[PDB]
Design a protein around this ligand. Structure first.
Ligand SMILES: [Zn+2]
Ligand SMILES: [Zn+2]
Ligand SMILES: [Zn+2]
Ligand SMILES: [Zn+2]
Lengths: 211, 211, 211, 211
């Protein structure tokens, strides 16, 4: 199956050519960099790029994607990207976008030994336990699973709010604001979970109120 | 500037509608999941999604994006995604894609205190030191910077090869194979660094030869 | 103050000599390695070594020490040591030992920007929030602080129980068992928090029951 | 074997009593905290506590212990402890202490699948590759292994020097200074590897010179 990859280069040239066909300054626009307005934290197993889903222009989104769109406090990968987006790129928005049908969430919920994946998926099991009463009450399994996807987005938003960068910038500037959204591969629609950003911040501030 | 975000939802519906216009089974195709053939490790500050650059179909790529497309051995985020892609998704290809003009590489090369970012960017400085003689010899700064982008891709490919998952699968199956590519925002072209995958594996195997 | 360190070597020779004086086979015993019976997870700012506090013999304890004796699921340092102690050393006991007066806990509770320390100490603030009602009810600050030290030990014990290694070994072998203890620098006494190990395991098993 | 642990509490009381017997203000001294003068980074599988080996007083050493005494740049555990020791405790010395016979180093050198341990031990294999020519030249295996222990200490010292905290403090204050030592369980002696601290710093500064 040696040919399959050499094909990726032909499809790349084709895409470049039509994009110039669609717009002559396409790669001229691309080159002069205005900072992204968004930090997007999404899932590695979601199937459509944020830029497609949202209609955002190239360079408008700075993108982190990981299994189940997690924001873990001892994960330097994501922590350093939040820090960098807020403090140095001066992003106006941070979105955590989950998606229904998420493979990572489903795999988190399977009681098996997944090696290296175990401590990663553990975070999702932690989300479940944080809402155990509500989740267990939901009879249908798929409905429960979708609710878990949603609560995970909410909890990862809470974890973004805990960051010093976010709080300092918000105090000083009133930005970035945080959004929790969920994409639905069935109808292609983005849904806003209407994450109550101000109240999350107030709850976290009870023991961590900075200037 | 309260309106700007509510606009993202209108652009989402517009994108969904035209995609159905372009193809009626678009969201029907999207729903029935064939595993991705690729794991793509790219940079958070690259501006065009892999799916665009390569012409790959939605769901064909499982995507991780982080600052400067790093594969760090104590980063559970990326390690768990490599493990998951190789062992459970049975990905046929792993691509590390860097890009010229990379902000993360450039910031790594600035001698300043960037807080949380410091130990992340340190990895890139480690790449420089690994090729210090070659890099220092390059007089022009931008040329040096582009070469660093390239060597970083090569070194992160080496780090993918060190993984037990990769070696075991390759021994048993002959896949995944690893690619190191670099995107160029100036002309939109993907370039293959022609990473010599077999020899990297042999060098690493001198002290870590598994079955 | 150049001399102060060269003194450490004289004190080392003195300690070696008296230990031979105290016992001639001291370094002969030391050399033939029986696996540790304990994994000890303690705090970097505790002042007396576990081996002293407990009367354990050298080599009896495999020791991890970090700020505030945390067991974080995305911390490969501690996760790999739990995995290694349980699976390869076949440790019979895992102890999480906190200590009153803990500087890390106190610093977690100070609302300031501590740079790199912020996401580490965040874990402790997470413990507080998990028991917010109980903790806030405690009027006296020091009493609250001691209670937090205790609850942190309990929560880090819960995090050890979530590990696949621990559960598998316990199912198969009935070991290791987990202990949560707290050292008190004021009277030198170890206190058992009497962590109910079996019930923690049952609660965690509601969504993660392995074989 | 239910009794074995309840014994640890009797040995604790015995130790407390004799320590008061040895010195009446022992626990009074312990309570009033002068900051540690040392940050000690040692190995989890070393058998004698630093405080014993060195003759240091309780509270004089702030201690981190992990498998093979590694200082990994994406390990928040150790990075946050270096940051905290240098910036907030104002430690005068940082010691990385390895030890001959190290189980972690030996296990790193075994070509097998150790699960979660793999990416941790990979760091040690990286040290080997950095000195591959020198190490491979050493015919005797044990001699090679001891040399690897030594080079690992040297490389982890280099990694401490890369930290912003260390460089800033050293520039401003002339402290902390960094030491690389190795303990020998056979004779109980500490050996100084005489890590050339100033030159390491100069080499690292070629691309990372801060103020
Ligand atoms: Zn997903
Ligand atoms: Zn980049
Ligand atoms: Zn402490
Ligand atoms: Zn060791």
């Amino acid at each position: 199956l040696q040919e399959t990859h050499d094909k990726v280069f032909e499809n790349n040239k084709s895409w470049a050519t039509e994009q110039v066909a669609k717009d002559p300054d396409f790669f001229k626009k691309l080159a002069a960099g205005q900072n992204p307005e968004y930090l997007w934290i999404g899932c590695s197993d979601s199937r459509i790029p944020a830029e497609q889903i949202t209609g955002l222009q190239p360079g408008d989104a700075f993108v982190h994607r990981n299994i189940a769109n997690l924001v873990c406090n001892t994960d330097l990968n994501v922590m350093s990207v939040i820090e960098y987006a807020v403090k140095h790129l001066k992003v106006k928005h941070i979105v955590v976008c989950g998606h229904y049908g998420c493979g990572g969430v489903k795999a988190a919920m399977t009681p098996k030994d997944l090696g290296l994946m175990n401590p990663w998926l553990r975070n999702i099991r932690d989300v479940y336990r944080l809402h155990e009463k509500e989740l267990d009450a939901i009879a249908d399994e798929e409905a429960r699973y979708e609710r878990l996807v949603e609560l995970n987005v909410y909890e990862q938003c809470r974890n973004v709010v805990k960051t010093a960068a976010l709080q300092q910038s918000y105090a000083e500037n009133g930005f970035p604001v945080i959004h929790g959204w969920v994409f639905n591969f069935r109808d292609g629609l983005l849904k806003d979970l209407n994450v109550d950003f101000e109240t999350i911040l107030k709850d976290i501030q009870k023991i961590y109120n900075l200037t």
